[PDB]
Structures are given as structure tokens and as C-alpha cells.
Amino acid sequence: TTTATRLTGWGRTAPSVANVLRTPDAEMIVKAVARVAESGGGRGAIARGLGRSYGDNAQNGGGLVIDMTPLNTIHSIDADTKLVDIDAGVNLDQLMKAALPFGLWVPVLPGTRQVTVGGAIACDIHGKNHHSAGSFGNHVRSMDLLTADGEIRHLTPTGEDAELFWATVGGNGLTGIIMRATIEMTPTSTAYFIADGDVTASLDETIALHSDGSEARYTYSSAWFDAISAPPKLGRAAVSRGRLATVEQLPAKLRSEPLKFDRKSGTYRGKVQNLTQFYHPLDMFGEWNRAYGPAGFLQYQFVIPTEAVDEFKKIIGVIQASGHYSFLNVFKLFGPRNQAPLSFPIPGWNICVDFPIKDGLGKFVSELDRRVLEFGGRLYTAKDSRTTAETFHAMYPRVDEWISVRRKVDPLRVFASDMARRLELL
């Protein structure tokens, strides 16, 4: 039934060995969880999707890992209610292709479509449209959670099980196995964006452009950010913003199949782009850490609360002065947060950087951790396998609430991961 397998996060770091169950048979999955429960816990079980998380949340050294990628059936698509009912193992690429002809758009899209719905919910992922759409959890209408008791629990965001539902969103698999979910899609009439580009010359300008009220004009916005240049060029950005195009906005040639699947003159208006172009160059650089890992690069993502913009500038300054130089930097202003205790996004200044691994780096990122922490920010479990339980708990003031919910639902700790042990969420 199971295969012992060396697992790592996306960037190939922090390996551990788990027994991997890989079956399309939901009943075998139910049986396996039950068997772990009847052994009284042991080293537990965790779900795994496509392994795009950079962290150690989708592995469980010495225990069970359940590869959910074979549960990939799309059960129903409904264009009136905009609801799709899909297995947790279906990936966003797969769903995007299946839903487009219905005029439905995946409501939150990360930098790669090679993630499962289960992984999307478990890490409450965010996209270029976060300030307008919230995160992936905001669009979950129901989900079926296989819990430690071996029961499949139907959860809703306002029902009697709302508490468990919202601990599952962003819960990193630690409430049980998401089997299946119903997602509310976004109506669209085309598969293209109409984009506006702007290039800033400085950090202050980047921040000004994000605080001048223009963000409200775009459903989607992100920026490519300079973290190496000496000030005042430090913080300058290439900002890509836009919204889904209506068919009248499409160039003549493309109006045929509008829902088709798949230095400083970087300034433009009303350019029409498909998903790949609009998100460029995220797709071509996505394999980077995996291609040169585990020894090449350390990704590092954090968000600082909106009101702490000065503290945010200081961290950027510290990064530039450090000697650790990152070219791949993505920046965004997050919008309002949701109600999941462990959700990563909060409104504020979000950036992912990617350091070359060098002498002094580990010590340096521990320094960043402290600053992010004190300034009221957080790290993201999808991007971390290095921080401490103390640091993480301090970054998530709702962690004890979350742990309490996890205790109600998994008293024997049937669910466990390397991450849960490292960060003391277990």
C-alpha cells in the first residue's frame, strides 16, 4: 500500500522520510487514517498535494504522508451559482481549463497553477488580486474534511462547524484531510487581462503609488521590486496592474474564442494579456530554487502591517545593506484579512525575496525574523522551513485559539507534519 520516500519542500530543503500512500481510492484513504488513529496516534499522518510549498508542512518524517494528487475528479460545475465541486487533488491548471468554457475564472491564482485545491485551502493562498478578492479561503463555500475519528465532516464558513472550517483554512493539513471542496468561481467573459504598467524610481515612489487610491481601480496588482540598488534607487518597482477583459475590449482576432485556455518604457496603458503574459516573469522563474536547490537560494516572504510603512522601509534598507543580494523580488499591498486564525495575509506591505545562500545568511534572516515580528508582521508557512516555534507563535497572536480548535478535532494528534513539530503546533 505505502512507499517509503524521501520528501522535501519545493526548493529541495529539509528532507525527511515518510511512508507515502498514493491511491485514487478514497476508502483506502479513510482506512489509512483510521488505522493511524487505532495505533493511538504514533507519528501521525499529513496530506500532500503537488509539493509546491517551500516548507516542511507537506512531509512527516517517520510517519504517514498521503499523496492526494490521485483524487482529481471534478464532480460538478454550475455557471449560475458559479460553484465548482472538486476533489482536493485537482490542480488549478486543471480547474482553470475545465471551468473557462462555463465563463468561470479561478478566484485566486498564485504564481503557479500547479497547486492542488487542498494545498490552496490549507495554506490559504493569495494572488495578485488579494486586495480585491481576499485569499483562497474567502471563496470556499464548503469542504469535506476527513477527521481523526474517520468521519468525513461537511464544513461551511457560517455553519455550526465554522470554527473548524476556519481552522482548516490556513491549517496546513493539521485538522485532517480535505477530500473535496466547493469553490465559488469568478464570472468572466474572457480569459484575458487588460493591464496598465508603471515604473517607479524609488521606494518612496513605489509606496506613494500604492497609497494614492489607484489600487482601488484594479482588481489585480503586483510589482517586481529592486532590493539590490543603493538608495534612492532602492525600492523602485515595475508595477503590473489590471483586471479581466470584457470581450468588447479584445483585439478583433481574439473575439472569436474569448475564453481560450492558457528600463522605463515598461510603462503602458490598456495592454491586453493572457494569464502567462500578465503574470510574467513568475512562470519562467518558478523553477529557480528547485533547479539550484537545496544549496543555491533561500526564499523569504513577509508582510508588514499597512500602518507600519516606516518599519517596512527600514527592513528594505537593512536588506539592501546586508550584502545578501536578491533579484527575484515580488511585492504587493495585501487587502483586508479573513477570519482563519492562522491565515498568512494581513493588510500591508508584502514581499518575497530570494537570497543566494552565503556565509552569514542564516544569522541575517534570524535578524529579519525579529524585525518582522516586532513590527507586527509574519512569515508564511508555504515559504518557511527555518524559523522557530517561538518566533512563529509570536507572529500569530491567534495561534493558541487555533491550537485549541486543533485539540478539539484531533485529540490523539493523528495529524502531524515536520512543520507542526518544529513550530510546536502539533
Ligand X SMILES: C[C@@H](NC(=O)c1cc([N+](=O)[O-])cc(C(F)(F)F)c1)c1ccccc1
Ligand Y SMILES: Cc1cc2nc3c(=O)[nH]c(=O)nc-3n(C[C@H](O)[C@H](O)[C@H](O)COP(=O)(O)OP(=O)(O)OC[C@H]3O[C@@H](n4cnc5c(N)ncnc54)[C@H](O)[C@@H]3O)c2cc1C
Q: How many residues does this entry show for the chain?
A: 426
In degrees and rounded to multiples of 5, residue 69 shows phi and psi of: -55, -25
Residue 332 interface partner, choices ligand Y, ligand X, none, CB cut-off 5-8 Å depending on type: ligand X
125 and 164 Cβ atoms separated by less than 8 Å: no
Stretch that binds ligand X, among 30-38, 177-185, 317-325, 328-336 (CB under 6 A): 328-336
Stretch that binds ligand X, among 36-44, 88-96, 144-152, 325-333 (CB under 6 A): 325-333
CB of residue 54 to ligand X, shortest distance in Å = 7
Q: Binding string, 282-321, against ligand Y, x = CB under 6 A? A: ----x-----------------------------------
When asked if residue 53 is in the footprint of ligand Y (CB under 6 A), the reply is yes
Q: Which of residues 119-158 bind ligand Y (CB under 6 A)?
A: 119, 122-123, 125-127
Residue 352 interface partner, choices ligand Y, ligand X, none, CB cut-off 5-8 Å depending on type: ligand X
Q: Which CB, 249 or 343, lies closer to ligand Y?
A: 343
The residue count for binding ligand X (CB under 6 A) is 15
Annotated binding site: 47-57, 111, 116-119, 123-126, 178, 380
Matching residue, cell 469535506 = 144
58 closest CA partner among 303, 382, 305 = 382
10 closest CA partner among 54, 73, 46 = 54
Q: Which of residues 171-210 bind ligand Y (CB under 6 A)?
A: 172-173, 177-178
**CA atoms within a 13 Å half-sphere pointing along the CA-CB vector of 172:** 31
When asked if residue 382 is in the footprint of ligand Y (CB under 6 A), the reply is yes
Q: Which of residues 82-141 bind ligand X (CB under 6 A)?
A: 110-111, 126-128
Q: Which of residues 71-110 bind ligand Y (CB under 6 A)?
A: 88, 110
Annotated binding site for FAD: 47-57, 111, 116-119, 123-126, 178, 380
Q: Give the DSSP per-residue string, 178-202.
A: EEEEEEEPEE-S-SEEEEEEEE-SS
Q: What are 299's strand-pairing partners?
A: 354
Distance CA 135, CA 124 (A): 6
293 and 354 Cβ atoms separated by less than 8 Å: no
Among 131, 139, 332, 413, binds ligand X (CB under 6 A): 332
Q: Which CB, 47 or 106, lies closer to ligand Y?
A: 47
CB of residue 202 to ligand Y, shortest distance in Å = 25
The residue count for binding ligand Y (CB under 6 A) is 31
321 and 228 Cβ atoms separated by less than 8 Å: no
As given in the structure block, the three cell numbers for residue 304 are: 508588514
Among 7, 20, 37, 58, binds ligand Y (CB under 6 A): 58
The single-letter DSSP state of residue 124 is T
Beta strand 177-184 with 140-146: parallel, antiparallel or unpaired?
antiparallel
Among 20, 99, 115, 167, binds ligand Y (CB under 6 A): 115
Q: Which CB, 116 or 206, lies closer to ligand Y?
A: 116
Among 18, 234, 352, 420, binds ligand X (CB under 6 A): 352
Q: Tell how far CA 192 is from the center of its chain.
A: 22
Distance CA 149, CA 135 (A): 29
Distance CA 242, CA 193 (A): 6
182 and 85 Cβ atoms separated by less than 8 Å: yes
When asked if residue 324 is in the footprint of ligand X (CB under 6 A), the reply is no
Q: Which residues bind ligand Y (CB under 6 A)?
A: 10, 46-53, 57-58, 68, 88, 110-112, 115-116, 118-119, 122-123, 125-127, 172-173, 177-178, 286, 382
